[PDB]
Paper text:
FcγRs bind IgG through the invariant homodimeric crystallizable fragment (Fc) formed by the C-terminal halves of the gamma heavy chain. Mice strains express three IgG2 subclasses: IgG2a, 2b and 2c that share 74–80% primary sequence identity in the hinge and Fc regions with greatest similarity in the receptor binding Cγ2 domains. With this expression and NMR technique we investigated mouse antibody fragments and characterized differences in structure and function between mouse IgG2b and 2c Fc. Here we demonstrate that mouse IgG2b and 2c have similar Fc structures for the complex-type N-glycoforms, however mIgG2c Fc binds FcγRIV with greater affinity.
Maps revealed clear electron density for all portions of the core Cγ2 and Cγ3 domains with one exception: the Cγ2 domain from chain B of mIgG2c Fc with a full-length N-glycan crystallized in an asymmetric unit without contacts stabilizing the chain B Cγ2 domain and some residues of the BC, DE and FG loops were unresolved despite high resolution diffraction (2.05 Å). Two differences between mIgG2c Fc and mIgG2b Fc emerged upon comparing both models solved with a full-length N-glycan: a difference in quaternary structure and a difference in the DE loop. Mouse IgG2c showed a closer approach of the Cγ2 domains and a more open Cγ2/Cγ3 angle. The DE loop of mIgG2c Fc N-glycan was shifted 2.0 Å relative to the same loop for mIgG2b Fc (measured from Y296 in an overlay of the Cγ2 domains). The N-glycans of these Fcs occupied nearly identical interfaces with polypeptide sidechains, thus restricting the differences between the position of N297 Cα residues to 0.8 Å in an overlay of the Cγ2 domains. This DE loop displacement was due to the presence of a Leu residue at position 300 in mIgG2c Fc (mIgG2b I300) that forms van der Waals interactions with Pro271 and shifts the Cα of residue 300 by 0.8 Å and R293 by 1.3 Å further away from the E strand relative to mIgG2b. Mouse IgG2c Fc bound mFcγRIV with 1.5-fold greater affinity than mIgG2b Fc when both contained core-fucosylated complex-type N-glycans. Without a structure of the mIgG:FcγRIV complex it is impossible to know which conformation is more relevant for receptor binding, however it is likely the conformation observed with the tighter-binding mIgG2c Fc displaying a complex-type N-glycan is the more relevant conformation. Mouse IgG2c Fc shows a different organization around L300, including Van der Waals interactions with P271 and an ionic interaction between E268 and R293.
Numbering used by the authors:
A (entry chain B): 238 to 265, 268 to 296, 300 to 325, 329 to 444
B (entry chain A): 236 to 443
Write the structure that this text describes.
């Protein structure tokens, strides 16, 4: 077989209310006896959840809940898998500079406020490292009809991205406050928002 | 461990703008110094064509040769879904390697394009960002660039395209503008080339 190790979501590690996880997905019915051991800076940990997946097209999935600060301070996380000789797989957050994002919600054209539904754009600029989470709300309630671009390497070595939220011309005209909510390690309490409305 | 072959499409800009020269390219990598003679043959809907420019390059990173064959093509032979095949011959190969490419069959839909002024809150800076917002297009291939007074600008960055919830694609391009340029009233244009657009082109301008 061959294994792939994935990082926690950056929003989960920066938000103490959330549950970050390191995930080990191992590729390759014959035998379903495969043990997955886990290590943080080479000390074995026994708290992972593993559930099995027989694929018809196997892959087993083991998720290690992690301490937020272990990821942030750069520890690695390793998964050793068993079922030849066993496969190792490591992962960590590398060290480097931090620059806070600048966040801007852009007013939409008028010709768009005409349509039954139109897009609000949030522009996020000047940040390092590139990992970032961007989502939206409406009157403080979680909103989901948005899409983010991938981050792009800008000329000064920082990153930028945009987020686009779809809105109902009816919800806008009733005075709903829309906000772009951005989570990044360079921000106060790891979060910042920008608001726009009809108003 | 012997030669391998990659085929590449024309730039979308070069097939959509009749004045430019699109090409289909076949690249052979890991050609040995001991067997440098590579014959590439080219077929358009399985009829052989003989006009490809084929040259060899020495690749110093790892002591290999690279053979690049660029077939110039008709803009409409790409747009109408003709198949372009390269066939590569070399004495290190048991039998020829063949690669085929074509413009895939699928939907067409023009992008909505808006250029947006800088954020109110960026106007305390030495430089500002203009945003070209490009929405609702199929297929995903697109070219986007900028100009100031017809000079091409180079200080812009495009995001990759993103699959939207309706199945179309969107993208943004951000241009950096010096405060003084913006203030003296220079005209900034976002130009977008897509097969959906009447005359394959739209250009949106902004200033003030
Ligand atoms: C010996 O060394 C060779 C040097 O390699 C470099 O590799 C790095 C690791 C560094 O060490 C660097 O210093 C080295 O110089 C090495 O050759 C490479 O080997 C690879 C094969 O193992 C091969 O990988 C494939 O690349 C495909 C993409 O290729 C393009 O993108 C790269 C940049 O990412 C670029 O470097 C290449 O030259 C290709 O660039 C494109 O070229 C086309 C054709 O010219 C351009 O299109 C034309 O453009 C003109 C004008 O310029 C007109 O527009 C015309 O009409 C067009 O036709 C195009 O613009 C250009 N793109 C870019 C971005 O520049 C991948 O597609 C491919 O992956 C596919 O397939 C694999 C497997 O089949 C799958 O795994 C993938 O999922 C995917 O489906 C794969 O990655 C490299 O391209 C090749 N590089 C070069 C320079 O030749 C060699 O292997 C080494 N050998 C040994 C034994 O070690």
């Amino acid at each position: 077989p061959s294994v792939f190790i994935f990082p926690p979501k950056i929003k989960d590690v920066l938000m103490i209310s959330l549950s970050p996880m390191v995930t080990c997905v191992v590729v390759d019915e014959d035998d379903p006896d495969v043990q997955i051991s886990w290590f943080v800076n080479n000390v074995e940990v026994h708290t992972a959840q593993t559930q099995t997946h027989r694929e018809d097209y196997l892959r087993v999935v083991s998720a290690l809940p992690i301490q937020h600060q272990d990821w942030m301070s750069g520890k690695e996380f390793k998964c050793k898998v068993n079922n030849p000789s066993p496969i190792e797989k490591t992962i960590s957050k590398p060290r480097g500079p931090v620059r806070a994002p600048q966040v801007y919600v852009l007013p939409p054209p008028a010709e768009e406020m005409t349509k039954k539904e139109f897009s609000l754009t949030c522009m996020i600029t000047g940040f390092l490292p590139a990992e970032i989470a961007v989502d939206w709300t409406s009157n403080g309630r979680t909103e989901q009809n948005y899409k983010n671009t991938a981050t792009v390497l800008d000329s000064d070595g920082s990153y930028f991205m945009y987020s686009k939220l779809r809105v109902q011309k009816s919800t806008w005209e009733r005075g709903s406050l829309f906000a772009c909510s951005v989570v990044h390690e360079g921000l106060h309490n790891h979060l910042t928002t920008k608001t726009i409305s009809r108003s």
